[PDB]
């Protein structure tokens, strides 16, 4: 379940755990190309990664609060802190690489 | 030899001969990808093709007048009539083909 955020909800939605946030807009015909990517990533990683989308056409205030100057821009957040920035289109493999830098490599069994 | 249009000059700049017009904005990263393509097109066929760019963030009137609803959008015009519309990114070869349908 990819979440649709609003200016009002963005903070809460992104504040906890590992989160990939997608700043996009219908007007940037392009930035839509990310949407199927997010679906594949949600299929593969959804247990460990919360995906949040925010349509910056409808939600005009969030971009400025995160220094988003062009769309699309994706962010990786851990516990509400931005830990990666990805400007422009990137394929599933590139975004998987970024997120994985912030997830456990090992799971120790005691 | 690409022309940067404004809302005021757009209709006049695209009114004659074969024209490729690019609707883009710095705010849209995919729209910027069109630029090197246009430079290559100009190098290849600049004597037969006029290329006009319009930054819709600084010139928002023109997008409405041409029914542009997302960016980028490219138009081919012949003597001021829109004869092809291309929504989204397309590579040089695809745009070259669109224009070539309107030469001669």
Numbering used by the authors:
A (entry chain A): 2 to 111
B (entry chain B): 2 to 105
What sentences appear in the manuscript?
Thioredoxin is a ubiquitous protein that is present in nearly all known organisms from archaea to humans. Importantly, the lower pKa value of the N-terminal cysteine of thioredoxin promotes its existence as a thiolate, the reactive deprotonated form of thiol, and this thiolate can act as a nucleophile to combine with a protein substrate, resulting in a covalently linked mixed disulfide (thioredoxin–S–S–protein).
Here we present the first structure of a BsTrxA C32S homodimer at 1.5 Å resolution. In addition, dimerization is facilitated by intermolecular hydrogen bonds and hydrophobic interactions. Intermolecular hydrogen bonds occur between the backbone amide nitrogen of Ile72 and the carbonyl of Trp28, and between the backbone carbonyl of Ile72 and the amide nitrogen of Gly30. The large hydrophobic residue Trp28, which precedes the catalytic Cys29, interacts with a shallow hydrophobic pocket on the other chain consisting of the side chains of Ala26, Trp28, Val57, Ala64, Val69, and Ile72. The crystal structure shows that the side chain of the mutated residue C32S points away from the intermolecular disulfide Cys29-Cys29 bond, forming hydrogen bonds to the backbone amide of Ala26 and the carbonyls of Ala26 or Cys29. In the BsTrxA homodimer structure described here, only two of these loops are involved in the interactions; the third loop (residues 88–91) does not interact with the other chain of the dimer. Taken together, our present structural analysis of the C32S BsTrxA dimer indicates that the high-resolution structure obtained in this study can serve to visualize a mixed disulfide intermediate state in the thiol–disulfide exchange reaction catalyzed by the native enzyme.
